[model samples]
Target chain A: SVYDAAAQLTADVKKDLRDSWKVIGSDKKGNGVALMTTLFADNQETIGYFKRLGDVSQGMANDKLRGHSITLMYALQNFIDQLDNPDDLVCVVEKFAVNHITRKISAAEFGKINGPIKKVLASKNFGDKYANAWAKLVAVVQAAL
Target chain B: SVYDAAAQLTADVKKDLRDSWKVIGSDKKGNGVALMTTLFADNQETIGYFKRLGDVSQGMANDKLRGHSITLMYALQNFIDQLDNPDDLVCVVEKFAVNHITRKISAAEFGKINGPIKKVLASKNFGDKYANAWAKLVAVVQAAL
Candidate 1:
């Protein structure tokens, strides 16, 4: 029912998020590193995920953050692309949830980036609407888990 | 038993957060503005909460962010100080929960800063122990909320 509500929920707000998502998610300027830097900065514990970011702040410059950001961007873009099919988005996050659990990351830790990610998008010209839209989608991800 | 668990929870992680908290919480070299700037930058939606940060990123130069950061610092210090007092920590977060609801912020939204705050501490020369400690406290915040 939640997914149904989310799936059926269409608004100009969601469209703003999709536009902003495209701006950063497409890797045009590789802005994902900035986004990932903010994310890792927020949860330094997760920096352990990237051995290459040995210092973690190195995430701002190193290839690891860039690569990881690209990977995440792809996954996220896929989720965004499939917003039309709520089931597909659920499957995507469900798979991500499995992978994260295997890595011993709790749901709370996994969800930590939602705020920073929204912030990152905020920096990219997104607004409260985007923030709200992002939260709705994230709740879907949480539910899938 | 309650005090004993938290008191015994330290493996120097709590020490790391404590040590690092002093460095930033005290506003060494004017770090609070940067922190608040990043905070607002990420959640521009909250910027409306600050008429002073009329432009959001402008928080970097203004006293509004600095003043707000100090308020946050005070609250965080209280939480850190009461870490061993399970009842006290619960009261701290419970109080925080009440303010956030009145502010219309969600638990997830309120908890969003945990990771970035850890990263900020991490940037301040705090290590994995501090990062780990920070996560644990954040978990408590989430739980209390």
Candidate 2:
């Protein structure tokens, strides 16, 4: 279960997660925009899901895309804030999964964001330590989906 | 300024807010779908903003609309959970405002959702007491936008 996996996160790993987020999450919307831009570039097929933004090929420069990016970042922040509380964390993840399901997004499609996440983390100079911590969390979320 | 206003919510009003939420929030996605469906019906002009849904006049029966409704409900839940912490609550509201601004949604446009919200509450049998409490919270959010 996602809760079981999330519960396995060590105290050190949790600290690393929180610390790294403080740095990268500082520019919440910007980081989100960068992440989505990278994802679309790496996987052009995924862009079809965001038809409302018209043409995202030029990147997430549109106002609607920017707004969605901000919302995504805030959602991530909410998840990070609940890390210490596994029950609440799992509840949030489950709701996220339910929403994605409503959009007809499969777990495999949800996991596709991992590549962009790793790329963004490495570009920020966060090595395997921080990246691995985030990967664990992402895996839990993906599993829930 | 929004925080200053939020600070004035009496303990009783806050209790009513939380208590009423417990009942209405039980079915988060359904409540959100109902709210948005009502909003689009009552304010047909607003439906243009959700072009991706491809004619929401039929209501939020579409998968994408359902997904978005879930997200909106969770966002509301997040705000409700932060009610006791004015600093966090204000931060959330500010981020919400920023997102709406990027979408070119004016404060006046944002406030239009209030009518649907009150309608939903009334349908749920929540009298003026609960509606007024929620209205205070909505006013603060609107002022921030």
Candidate 3:
């Protein structure tokens, strides 16, 4: 039988997230903006979607990107905070699906996200253990979606 | 200026992502699970982190893997959707960093992700065009991290 992969996210792994989220939440919005800005700078095709952001340069997207970044920060923090509450973890994902289904979001697009999430946080030294936790969380969300 | 390599994704290149993501999103979560599970199979060291997943057979984590697969699917969809909305793409990336920072998810682990993501997605005959898109995505993520 296939094992319960998410069940494997032990106390230690969640602790890793707790520790990291603390620092991340310190300058939560900034942290979020930095990552998203780079995501924009890195993935240009991504530039055409937002009418406001369509004209972005490497250092652009102040209001819109920042707003969404904070929103994302809250969502992810919710996941980390609710790790023990299994249902709560998927709460955000469930909400996203309801609206995004109409938007035509794809799985491959969903699948490839963690890499950037992990990379932008690289400077802070998020080790593999934390990586596993995030991956596990993403898996759970994917299942729900 | 450092080469903003991710920008090289031409309309011709994204045309490939469109072709492949259409199919990849069909089974959506399935393709993502296939990739991550395969990653676990290939990188045994990753297995140790997950108590439940560690016990998994090579093709295990099927159910759990599927969930995260969908989560990833949404991310890429956002990426593609935001092809014009660069700011929005970063918003997602930023949310990831806010918590990932303290968690310590490393570059190498992050680096390991693309291999399986691209490989499995590639299986559906994504061809060179999809290949280019995925590679560009990886490079973009790599640069951000």
Candidate 4:
């Protein structure tokens, strides 16, 4: 329950300076070292949301479909991109399945992410299905990274 | 393996009423139970945004800044009100800030809450000084919370 200030977290990252953790999708560059532990983000509001969710996401920590860290990141990035200009659904589904293969993603855990994706799609008018499928593909490729 | 659709993991009511949480300017009547969890508006965007942020909000967790839970609830309400009223984003920020004072919220961890609060303020062309002030407020509050 370390509710440190967002700026302090950024400062800690800047001060710590790690080469291993590179922040993708953000070009502005954070002030801190951006340590995996510190997890600094210029978008503190979005960061706040993510940090908040992580607490609950841990409940699924033992999940099987949980892919390799890299794969998960890649998949998430792909999902982010697709969220904007969504189009092909078949392509996205294939990608997600491929990502699973690459990460050796467990089926049980895939359901965790899948459950939400379907919930949003069935209820809302979003093209998350394609994005999700895209996520699965990127995850697989990311596992190779 | 741990799938219990019945188990409501999203909202925790008791914490919302811990005297730490606060609310204002609501016409509805309940034990504030409805406010305990997020109440989605008619808009597809905000509801989706809230859901994407996952189950709980950090403003609900930290002891020092838990009062933010109260202010934010109203902020969302105000945002919805904007569809019909449409004053400005800063007004929403100010209203939440005022709630803190009127509710006797300590002028402590202003930084943590302010950091994120300021960023959201930028949704409209409010002002940078205000954003910075709120950012600092969030940091200070987070430190205390």
Residue range A43-94, candidate 4, lDDT tens digits? 2322342332244223223121111222233333333333322232122334
lDDT of prediction 1? 0.60
lDDT of 3 by residue, A1-145 (tens): 0124345568877887788778776665568767676666666555565454434453434555564665666557546655675443454455554444555555555555566667655768877766666776666656544
Error of 2 at A52 (Å): 22
lDDT of 2 by residue, B1-145 (tens): 9879778778998898888888888776568789999998899888888886566656545656765675677678766766787765676677677657777988788888878888888888988888888888888778777
TM (chain A) per model: 0.80, 0.92, 0.77, 0.26
TM-score of chain B of each: 0.74, 0.92, 0.75, 0.25
- Give residue A139's lDDT in candidate 3 (0 to 100): 68
List runs of model 3 lying over 4 Å from the truth. Answer: A1-145, B1-5, B48-64, B97-102
Per-residue lDDT tens digits for candidate 3, residues B41-128, read: 7886776554433345534244333444455555666566545545555555544443344445554666676667667766875565
How high is the DockQ of candidate 4?
A: 0.01
- Tell me how large the interface RMSD of candidate 1 is: 19.1
Cand 1, B chain, TM? 0.74
Residue A51's lDDT in candidate 4? 35
* Model 4: CAPRI class: incorrect
Candidate 1, position B64, lDDT: 40
> Which is the better candidate, 2 or 4, if ranked by DockQ?
2
Clashes by residue pair, model 2: none
Ranking by lDDT: 2, 1, 3, 4
